Symmetry: D2
Subunit: 347 residues, 4 copies
């Protein structure tokens, strides 16, 4: 059944030309498993991977995409817990070494041999892609794969962020950039986890979408000038935890000021070489923690997909065929991502 | 017995002239209690208070000192748990409002009405000083008050820092500035708490004193150039938690790079208007937390004084009379603090 | 304005006769504050206090009630943070010594000098009652005092329990006794905190009320025989955290078996001298934690009253006059508490 | 080099006769790896496995032993992170499914498909034994394998226990049964982690050995009658965390009474069908947590072996040949284990 060739967009030279062609099927190593990828999201990480600008060297030739979702067609002889026909998800972190120290502690994303899907491994921009049998996401049966694709890297990231913010149910969380592709999932996850969301975003239709997905207070970062004072006024003391999913370094810097004392400031957005210069005196006096957060581990994956299965979170996807993926990249690096451009592999 | 006047160094105008004179005894408010201060430490915080440069306005006239230790002579009618003749310690945070939200959570140092001793309240540079009956430190009987004076603001600070670093016994902690007045207490507390200390300091005799108080690995920040690589080599991956007690902003910036992934970087030293510009990408990818830490709360006070009572920590004090306190300040802002200039009130 | 006498139900001899009479006003000690109690709840704790059967000796003569809510008429000279006319709540733990070790750590309810309201202090069954200025609850203005009365000991208890269960949003919590006076508030707080509630109760109308206040799965402990298997079937592995608000020791014992491995079993209900004999082998192998939980501290008080202010939790109170309080006790020790018999002080 | 047969003690029928004979070499599955076991400890768990009395059915025929340590001779094709000639340790939990929910969270010991070494898998009582490449312990090179054998199940267990006790450096920990084979390692680990050890044991030479390995206070459970009062007197309020490594159910019951309020009581010893009947009222009022603790996970393994590598913990082993293993079992079920009967495989 597995066709000896599949369709996919691959590129050989970094920042080169996305060639939609046919490629042999990756065979599943004894530990890996093959996935007939049905849909796949796209995010800034795929741009950075195709650029090659990030410090780690991208394994070329490379088929991109780290937010893939599909059905298992063939597993490795060593695999257990998986069955054929199951719904699996190729996350960003493809496979870790399961033998260092971070792999053991749970933070698998920092393994010095972290095989990154779509960066150092065949990504999720093909009809069939291989992925580690342990790190793959157990997408529950019957789920709408196209709808769940963005949750696999975006939703998991914001969920691990919120868990890293050290918030208690009823506290104030400020999603700096709540209308964005990450911000909307962050707001939904925060409202589901019991926090009180305070979005900070601006532009056209942003506040409307934010009210739609459910948010207590909205702060337009274009109309309101003193954002810090506005947040301190709304939350009455500062947000108990901020999530910097925005891309403006200025917004990150301003985030370390409207966070309540003893609060937390999760850094998630990774703008182009920015610095989080917080006033060391103001940070010490108020004991403000500025935590970073990479893609979540397996437990976070399971819990985020659980939150999705209960219909709590929703992603306004825009299904698009795979053949036009180069045009998708072109509009992406120009900033045309409106909701979330989930790609379709069959098309 | 309480003399209607006591000796003390007071100053009326910020950055003015330290007048050693006689002052009426502060009467203990129903909640406060009076303390015949026997000894008192000095630290950069007292310099900043006498300057007035810090944002909060210093209550003038002001008798300085926030690291005082003495014997209770008279308590307020409302006070309970205290007895006359007990050994009490005037910490930095004199009295909080015990009715807001941070006071309740335990982080009393952030109360918007935090009465700061020696900054907004009569400090510990007098024969007799009043202090809150709740925040005062319960110095155990028989303790050498002169020896315990530095533990009251320095030791408590580094202990709350180490507790904030989220380390487990056996991890690697890098005390950036281990030979300093804060660094030595930090190293002793870390070794007592089970961590593996890695000091980062330099100068004359620093490494010798560091080996004396007990430290695994020392890194001279003047001879060694690539500090980051050196720490990564010694700790084999990065220190599980860094404590930035140094005053060089450059050292703080370099600290966010030799901290192990998923580690922590407690900011304690408050240099003159510095910025902790950490590479947001490197901080996110490795999930490095940069936590701040102010003076510890009451529980930290009790635990740190307990560590001192078991003879685990030691402070190389230099007892000096109170009369020469202006000269002490003069040599201090010139940088003549060698070990820790603990002052004597009687002298 | 303060009348030199007020109405109240007092009793002199333990398990004696509840005399509704007039009593002089308690004067507020410099640390305490007076409260014109407007309403007050009742719970099994008041029965146990009136019996005197509990080990601690009840201060006689004693006016009962530990769930009082009223308006501040006069505060002590030492009090700060409070204003006249504010809405305050007399919780169970009236005043702690704020000088021992548990008081410092936050667990004030275990202070060896814990002044227990209605047990060792003048309770909340009078028109005017005094209460500690620190431990009193800051009931927000405009709140319906009669509605908030049960939240002051019941709601706070179940909230501290759920926080002690160590659950993450999306986990399974089994409120053993969900329909009871404590169980309903527990279910509401759990649903608000993001958990997935699984009630275990039975009787008449219980499941209907449980569906009303919002609960995923209900297990009738009278119709269903194998409760353990039923819970394991519903939660698919065991509830991530159980809350034993029931009074049947058998139910507590059965609770240590349907809790998921690595889960938790908060003990809250205090039946008449029961034992939690859990199979030590089964508890070890599955690493099941059986945590206890007394009344919450000040932070829990603030957070629970916050959850109430957002209209998330609701208590089906039954306002009853104070004059009939003896009949209330009589019907109580016979088991006639239907919803929650909140008493009215004016009536 | 791998001999087609090796020596080993195997038994076919539960509670049967230990036959020392020759057995074919287990071949390493693609995920497993073979280990030329050099030494191996023995503990009550091996008795229970040979009995078959434990609920899980023991895979027969079965070679016992779960505390093995040896050198890797041949790894599976899929294995990464391991090299030939490395020092590996066969712990109790041989291999988990790494695909359920507990495996993901880190608590691998509760996987419903937890392959238990020496219970459901070929144990460590043979010259060569296979073990999972992930769960195997990375014994550092040059370590004295005979000395490290007991640390592989005993030391890891007590370390995970102490970590589960939720203690802070400087607190009081009561090792109920400090002189025993588990108690001695517990005391050493506690002293290394910074806690203040208070042993509770009795018999001949017990207190002497306890003073030897380093313990603050010792309580003879045979001479002293009121153990609870004695511990409350020594620790001044109750031990902040108790570790019930003893086998007397009476001692476990007595443990839930001398634990300080808000403390913890780790259950580790698994006596023959015992019950931890704690007074539910006393447990609630003091909020005493009774946590269980099975064998630690991989992170605990690494940290415990690290504590061993720094020479902090030591096990008084008694090297004995493998041929006499049946006599070892016979003396064991009669209670002749004096220190720790580490077996030698070559002999
Ligand atoms: N850490 C991870 O694992 C991970 C994974 C995926 C994406 N990311 C990061 O997510 C970001 C992209 O998120 P997205 O898809 O929502 O991007 P987007 O560009 O689609 O949306 C960004 C949002 O930021 C808002 N914004 C812009 N300037 C702002 C300001 N000054 N203050 C507040 N909000 C402001 C915009 O209005 C918009 O709502 C990138 O930084 C990317 O690297 C991180
Ligand atoms: N947060 C608080 O509650 C609190 C309280 C008291 C003091 N402090 C802070 O403590 C600091 C003073 O500490 P101290 O008394 O030890 O000061 P100190 O000047 O006596 O010693 C500072 C130490 O830093 C070392 N150092 C200098 N440059 C360094 C570099 N580049 N890298 C590493 N180490 C370097 C020095 O050699 C010395 O050992 C100040 O920042 C002060 O504000 C904070
Ligand atoms: N720890 C504290 O701070 C604190 C404070 C207040 C009350 N409490 C405890 O709360 C309890 C009273 O709660 P309440 O007011 O809801 O009591 P209640 O008697 O009004 O209700 C008890 C509930 O338990 C249910 N139940 C009975 N048998 C059961 C069984 N076998 N399994 C499951 N559920 C069963 C009943 O149907 C009912 O829903 C008492 O134990 C009291 O001491 C504790
Ligand atoms: N949970 C796990 O992963 C795990 C692993 C291995 C062993 N264990 C358990 O460890 C226990 C064996 O430990 P050991 O090897 O030290 O056993 P042992 O029999 O060699 O020593 C037991 C100790 O308990 C002491 N003791 C006896 N009665 C006591 C009492 N009333 N109060 C206090 N102390 C008392 C004895 O004097 C002795 O010091 C068994 O329960 C076993 O199942 C658990
Ligand atoms: Zn790894
Ligand atoms: Zn993504
Ligand atoms: Zn306050
Ligand atoms: Zn100081
Ligand atoms: Zn107290
Ligand atoms: Zn109550
Ligand atoms: Zn599993
Ligand atoms: Zn063992």
């Amino acid at each position: 059944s597995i066709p000896e060739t599949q369709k996919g967009v691959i590129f050989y030279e970094s920042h080169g030309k996305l060639e939609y062609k046919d490629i042999p099927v990756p065979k599943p190593k004894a530990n890996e498993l093959l996935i007939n990828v049905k849909y796949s999201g796209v995010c800034h990480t795929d741009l950075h991977a195709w650029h090659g600008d990030w410090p780690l060297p991208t394994k070329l030739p490379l088929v991109g995409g780290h937010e893939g979702a599909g059905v298992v067609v063939g597993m490795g002889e060593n695999v257990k817990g998986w069955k054929i026909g199951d719904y699996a998800g190729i996350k960003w972190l493809n496979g870790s070494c399961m033998a260092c120290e971070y792999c053991e502690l749970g933070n698998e994303s920092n393994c010095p041999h972290a095989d990154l899907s779509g960066y150092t491994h065949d990504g999720s921009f093909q009809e069939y892609a291989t992925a580690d049998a342990v790190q793959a996401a157990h997408i529950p049966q019957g789920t709408d794969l196209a709808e769940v694709a963005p949750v696999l890297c975006a939703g998991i990231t914001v969920y691990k962020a919120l868990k890293s913010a050290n918030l208690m149910a009823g506290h104030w969380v400020a999603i700096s950039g709540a209308a964005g592709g990450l911000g909307s999932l962050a707001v939904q996850y925060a409202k589901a986890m019991g926090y009180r969301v305070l979005g900070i975003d601006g532009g056209e239709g942003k506040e409307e979408l934010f009210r739609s997905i459910g948010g207590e207070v909205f702060i337009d970062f274009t109309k309101e000038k003193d954002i810090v004072g506005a947040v301190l006024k709304a939350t009455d003391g500062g947000a108990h935890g901020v999530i910097n999913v925005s891309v403006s370094e200025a917004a990150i810097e301003a985030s370390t000021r409207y966070v309540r004392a003893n609060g937390t400031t999760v850094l998630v957005g990774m703008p182009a070489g920015a610095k989080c210069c917080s006033d060391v005196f103001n940070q010490v006096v108020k004991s403000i923690s500025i935590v970073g957060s990479y893609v979540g581990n397996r437990a976070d994956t399971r819990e985020a997909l659980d939150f999705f299965a209960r219909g709590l979170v929703k992603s306004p996807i825009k299904v698009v065929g795979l053949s036009t993926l180069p045009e998708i990249y072109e509009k992406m690096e120009k900033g045309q991502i409106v909701g979330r451009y989930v790609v379709d592999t069959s098309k």
